[PDB]
Design a protein around this ligand. Sequence first.
Ligand SMILES: O=C(O)c1ccc[n+]([C@@H]2O[C@H](COP(=O)([O-])O)[C@@H](O)[C@H]2O)c1
Ligand SMILES: O=C(O)c1ccc[n+]([C@@H]2O[C@H](COP(=O)([O-])O)[C@@H](O)[C@H]2O)c1
Ligand SMILES: O=C(O)c1ccc[n+]([C@@H]2O[C@H](COP(=O)([O-])O)[C@@H](O)[C@H]2O)c1
Ligand SMILES: O=C(O)c1ccc[n+]([C@@H]2O[C@H](COP(=O)([O-])O)[C@@H](O)[C@H]2O)c1
Ligand SMILES: O=C(O)c1ccc[n+]([C@@H]2O[C@H](COP(=O)([O-])O)[C@@H](O)[C@H]2O)c1
Ligand SMILES: O=C(O)c1ccc[n+]([C@@H]2O[C@H](COP(=O)([O-])O)[C@@H](O)[C@H]2O)c1
Lengths: 288, 288, 288, 288, 288, 288
Amino acid sequence: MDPEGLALLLPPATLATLADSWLREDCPGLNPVALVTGAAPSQAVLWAKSPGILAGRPFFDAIFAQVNCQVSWFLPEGSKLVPVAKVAEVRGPAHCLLLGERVALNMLARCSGVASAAATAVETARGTGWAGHVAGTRKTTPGFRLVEKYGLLVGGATSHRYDLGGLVMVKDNHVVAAGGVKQAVQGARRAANFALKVEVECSSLQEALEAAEAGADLVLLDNFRPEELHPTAAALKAQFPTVGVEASGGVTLDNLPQFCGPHIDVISLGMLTQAAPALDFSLKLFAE
Amino acid sequence: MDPEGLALLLPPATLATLADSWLREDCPGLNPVALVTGAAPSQAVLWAKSPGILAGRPFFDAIFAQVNCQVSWFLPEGSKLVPVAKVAEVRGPAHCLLLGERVALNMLARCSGVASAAATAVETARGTGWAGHVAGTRKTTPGFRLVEKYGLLVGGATSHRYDLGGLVMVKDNHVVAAGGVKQAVQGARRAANFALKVEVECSSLQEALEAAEAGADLVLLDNFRPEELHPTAAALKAQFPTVGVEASGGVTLDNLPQFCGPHIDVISLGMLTQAAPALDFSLKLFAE
Amino acid sequence: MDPEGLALLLPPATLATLADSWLREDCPGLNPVALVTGAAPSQAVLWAKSPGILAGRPFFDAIFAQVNCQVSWFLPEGSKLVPVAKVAEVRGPAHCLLLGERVALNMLARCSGVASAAATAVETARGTGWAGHVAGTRKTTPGFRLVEKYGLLVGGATSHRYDLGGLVMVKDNHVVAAGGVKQAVQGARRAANFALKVEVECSSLQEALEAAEAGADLVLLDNFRPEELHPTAAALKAQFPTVGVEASGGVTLDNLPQFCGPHIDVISLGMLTQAAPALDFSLKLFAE
Amino acid sequence: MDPEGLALLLPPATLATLADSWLREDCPGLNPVALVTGAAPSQAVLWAKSPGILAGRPFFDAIFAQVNCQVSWFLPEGSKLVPVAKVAEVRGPAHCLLLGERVALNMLARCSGVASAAATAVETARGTGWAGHVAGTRKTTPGFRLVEKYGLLVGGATSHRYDLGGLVMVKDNHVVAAGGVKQAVQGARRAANFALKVEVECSSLQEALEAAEAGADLVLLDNFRPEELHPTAAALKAQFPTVGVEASGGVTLDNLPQFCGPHIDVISLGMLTQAAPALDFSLKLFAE
Amino acid sequence: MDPEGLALLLPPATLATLADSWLREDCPGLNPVALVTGAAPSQAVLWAKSPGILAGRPFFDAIFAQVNCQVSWFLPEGSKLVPVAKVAEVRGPAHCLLLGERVALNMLARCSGVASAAATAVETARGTGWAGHVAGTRKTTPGFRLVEKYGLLVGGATSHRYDLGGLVMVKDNHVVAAGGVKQAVQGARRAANFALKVEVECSSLQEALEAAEAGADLVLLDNFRPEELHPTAAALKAQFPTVGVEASGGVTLDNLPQFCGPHIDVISLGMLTQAAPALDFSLKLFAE
Amino acid sequence: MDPEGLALLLPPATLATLADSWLREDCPGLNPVALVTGAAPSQAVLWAKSPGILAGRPFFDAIFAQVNCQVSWFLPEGSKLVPVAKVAEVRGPAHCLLLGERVALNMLARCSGVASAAATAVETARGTGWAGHVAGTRKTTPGFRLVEKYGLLVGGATSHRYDLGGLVMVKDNHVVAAGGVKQAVQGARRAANFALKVEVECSSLQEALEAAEAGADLVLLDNFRPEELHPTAAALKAQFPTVGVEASGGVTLDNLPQFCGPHIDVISLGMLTQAAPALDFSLKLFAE
Ligand SMILES: O=C(O)c1ccc[n+]([C@@H]2O[C@H](COP(=O)([O-])O)[C@@H](O)[C@H]2O)c1
Ligand SMILES: O=C(O)c1ccc[n+]([C@@H]2O[C@H](COP(=O)([O-])O)[C@@H](O)[C@H]2O)c1
Ligand SMILES: O=C(O)c1ccc[n+]([C@@H]2O[C@H](COP(=O)([O-])O)[C@@H](O)[C@H]2O)c1
Ligand SMILES: O=C(O)c1ccc[n+]([C@@H]2O[C@H](COP(=O)([O-])O)[C@@H](O)[C@H]2O)c1
Ligand SMILES: O=C(O)c1ccc[n+]([C@@H]2O[C@H](COP(=O)([O-])O)[C@@H](O)[C@H]2O)c1
Ligand SMILES: O=C(O)c1ccc[n+]([C@@H]2O[C@H](COP(=O)([O-])O)[C@@H](O)[C@H]2O)c1
């Protein structure tokens, strides 16, 4: 829920190991430009130049700790950012500060870009009175899923499935390989047991009812026009009152209100991670 | 750098290693949904649903090699994508094909997203009859730099410096820490020696002259208005005809042509990687 | 989850990586004994000297692939092992076959040891005509969880939750820290959202009611005497017919049937992994 | 020797890297249940619920240090454990305490289970007046050999060979590949040189004498009945007074005294690692 | 430049991760000899027994920090070493001191051996009045390039190219695969762009002029006798005044003065890393 | 240890892993020079330009397998190299062949450099008609120990102890910390038990006697003058005829014969790895 508690989701060793791979990527050997500046103790401020939502403090602190620098934060995680906000101050030896700089901003810029999109979508969804959840997807940048999912949460969206072991997601392709919806859910059931849930994407109302009848827990009504979506949803809820319904496909920040209806429990958008632009931050040294 | 020749830049062990870590990220332990489909030999078509430029084949192939699947491509790297292009076919056991799917689509979506953004930028700069390079920056998604830099190249843009190990890049922060521009170039010169180039971020003509004076191979005029840009470039280049001039900051697709001019050799944009929307691809099983 | 189909749950790169690290553990540098035998092509039989259930083939195959050896299997995964079953044959250079031997036997001994324990448990619970799942726990040997969970499945038991990323498991410690059961479920609900299930460790009927009250999908009645177990389960399930009931703690093979009852859906035992003796296998060269 | 000094065998970086892989296994991404408890500073006690021998403190401290928690010990390494002993207290933020919990107990439970078996075997062996060593084997859980060998030592058993580079062990299979005992020892000799020892398992008295005559340092009399074992041993010692003799195969905690004779220097048991049940520990939060 | 500032080139995490792999190599499991000494706090002195130049402090401190030991330095990085110099004192628990010992000396011995050769070559080159740079090569020990390049720098030599991404080096083989010098430089140009430099090794004067004419930045005059080298150099400089010239091949500490001429900007020697003997250091415990 | 049989000591996964990390070191990201040549199938000859002994084929093959290239060898491992021997041919895509080149040459140069040094040492000691082993030490390049120890073996020297996990080596520092020689051996004996040998660094006859007295298998007489060496060895060996004697320190090629004597079993030299110049190899494309 509240953005500041979300940092408890991240084990410190995980953050350090991650900050380490990123820095290795950016400077795998020697850092020549360190000779340009030397190591005098220095101070920089992180400035937010785009509007949105601050997300990524834990990764950010971790990166800078890998180059022996410390960060002091003026804004809490999940704060609205308004240009040109003095977000934080970073201190350490000049060469170490500037080595951490690029990696830290790249991370923060994207973590916050996702969180901003998430929050814009969630706020819009709220506007309609809808009580449902706005969710992300598995359309994340390979290697960088931890950061992107955390961004989503900071923006107030639900992670949805983190990985291929969190809930048994039966998609289009799986149905076809299985030879029909009933057949797919049947193997999904054996795979899920009591621990995991089963979600099946459906193209029609028959499929959605066949799904729920087989023992699906959630129904993903995929790529419906909203005109055809909500009656199908009401219908499914009418024959199956407990079954969660999700709506996905061709959803955008602009068209999202249309997708918000009383029989829809979840709306997921790929654009939260696929088309969320990075926020602009800078880090500038200052004297004192 | 003809499109298909760019694949030769990537060692295949680098590709296997990257692919492995991405599939690990997506499925760290058991793959329950495998029970849904079983393992019958299957085939899927990869469809491009967005217009643009195809990039990422070599990563795409390694991803599917890691779960023992083969790929035949109908479009070469660099191709203009027109919806709904049938772009490749993938064959392998049904469960393995579908394990590979998400990561492979997620990768290609972004690599092609970046190539698309670059190619568009290049077409614009070249339609002005400007004969410089359109460049990318170091503003890449942490962990995903090889794919994004490779994407940039496929789109005809220049990778620029791959990392802090290449050309010695002197930024405002470096100059400030160093106590001045010449002083910084002086440190930069011992860093670079005879093997590496020196570029210097300058935000004024005088700063630019002092940089070229102390031996900088390149001068980066940063966050100028186009109006101050060319007179300054003409000035510096008049006094130093051998020094390269890069412009950057604020540059977008819509406004690129006004940065195109005779005394500009390089134009970089953050936008090629920070605001590049991914392409929509799908992977669909067929012929049961 | 038919026996042989369970192999499909394991990505082969995961298997190669695991096998590699185990052989590394056993032989970090030089393999001196290789000089003893030389490299002539050789063949060995794998013998099962203990009764039980065979599990571990996919790990077994990857181990021997890493030292370039091939395996043909005469018994399918899931098979009842009767001494002295000839279970497979392994071929490869003599030195490579014998490097692979120890790790491969050590692995299969344990994976089959766990499957054996589970299958026995299942046979007992099912001979009572109880229609629930026999489950394992998270009490697995560190580093060896994939093998032990895979072993459990081959024996017909349920993996339960693979890790802390799956269903949100609320234990006594969690409830205490959270200051109470509902309060904890409340935190659990925001953790799980719509994708993940919530299970709650309850050691009394009232605690169980408050858990099901605040929305828990499952209630784990822990360290009950069988005598208090069923009346409590009947109670909770009477008030909440949709909530799953798990029993655990104290459960062994000898005493399992008294935990089998109508209002118990899941019975877990620590014993399946903590007290499961490994099977005796040997690998013997033949036909010089 | 004395159990408390054995911790000096373990390099701190080795323990940390190990604790890190185990935690990554158990929670590879986000820790949802952290939201259930929050991060308030908390305290738990480690309770020993089974009898035996405490082993594993160094790994245990290392795990908890990876999640920023501290442990205070009331029992020294190698102490007899009597239910329900208050073994130690762990302190740290509640979510970090509970994240370390499962992994720490799994490790300790098994390290101590091995050490308990070891000590039971060693005590029994002592009972007969026998001055020999009781040893473990290479029948260890793959990936977890460091912990299991350390357990053995804490229980007072000797590690035997840690890996395939510690002494040149010529087994059944190796003899056969080599074409006889003399031939095998001959290559073993060249492989061992002065640095390593040569041990050859023998099936008869001829083999044992051929072994010793070839230059074996130790003879492993494998799978003899004790009636046939000790005369063979005396015989071998009589023709070869310096040659170490080991007895192995079908040895159990119950039958071990039979195997203790004056001409036997070592008795090794696979059951110390293959059939040693885990000790029961718990960790319970407490208020103060 | 000045040897003491060169340590700023090395990110601390890089040094730690490196010190960690080296120690793992040397003791992958248990450290038996720790029982011989125990853990009493101890002190040792590092003695320099060979003449030369001290190089490697940062790696050295990092190794000892991995085994919880501290080092105090009496000589600065880049100091001349004269037998039998008391270079530094190391303190920590005795077993941890002695575990760090071998790895630390091996590193330092070689880092310093390279630096000594480098300095001997650089001093000799200076003797002639020559203003050029003395460079190393890519003939480094695999895995240990960071240390060897740093040694070179401490000795006052320039790193030259660190890796295959620092400058586009067109060698003999590449020319042949490309089908001539012009063809090679043409692809090198496209590969380099503005960021990287292009160096082409040439066998004759024609090749060197063809190189410079194609747009090479540096010419490597490879394996010339000095009699034929300097006129070729003057010639090339005469038709191309900006183009850097490097001389390489069959250069030794003894013959190097012959290679120093006014038209040579760089002289590189493989013997700086291929034939530089290790310096002799020891570490001896002392009482106090 | 016949030359070609030594290849059997190396697990091929160890080789793949090593090769991978070396190519990573040399080319962490993009390989720009690949554009220079393209990918046409090509062939190169490996030439030996220095006299000596060939060692490193198995590493050489793995290096070229990692960039998909094949190798045919015309000379077996252990061969005497006479300039300019055509030693192998390598085939593969031109860009891949040249990526592999540097690392493969760098490796073989050193591995053959060490083998050359050892073989020479052995020939000298054996030409004196001395029947002991010439040994190496633990003074190996960090990270490169497998190659250097393998190199030593190919040259006919003995690897000695591979690491701190093998024989318990008691050095002067160990003895000092332990407060005395017997005391140290006493600790060493419990460390080694029955599986591992004990060697003790002694710099005087009396120290040597106390070592052999307390049960040391080997006595290392360190930094003796040859003149004190043999009378001491004769002495110790007269009192203990079963204890091995190693001499070391100061030993070079030129002075080796005076260390060769009847009561010396092992002679080690630092020189085999610390002062062993690498062999000059080249790799040349041919037949366009
Ligand atoms: O795979 C899961 O992680 C998952 C969770 C929620 C939605 N999806 C898929 O995401 C797709 C939504 O993509 P989009 O870009 O059209 O918003 C939709 O077609 C579903 O198949 C997938
Ligand atoms: O570090 C690099 O290699 C690098 C290469 C090209 C550009 N940049 C930085 O990119 C900055 C602005 O890019 P933009 O389009 O995101 O505003 C500019 O200030 C440069 O210092 C950085
Ligand atoms: O963490 C899990 O996924 C998990 C799954 C199933 C069971 N457990 C725990 O196992 C405990 C007892 O098991 P046992 O058989 O070893 O006494 C019980 O208190 C549960 O909290 C834990
Ligand atoms: O391989 C060594 O690590 C080793 C050391 C001591 C004993 N062994 C083997 O261990 C076997 C003993 O197993 P067990 O389960 O019958 O007690 C015996 O047959 C020997 O072959 C093996
Ligand atoms: O590849 C670069 O790293 C590089 C930089 C400077 C010199 N070289 C090569 O190094 C060779 C010099 O080797 P040497 O051992 O003869 O001094 C020469 O033939 C050049 O091909 C190579
Ligand atoms: O640690 C080892 O395995 C080891 C094996 C053989 C020799 N050494 C050490 O090498 C030292 C001298 O070798 P050198 O030739 O470099 O002077 C001597 O004091 C031994 O302690 C060390």
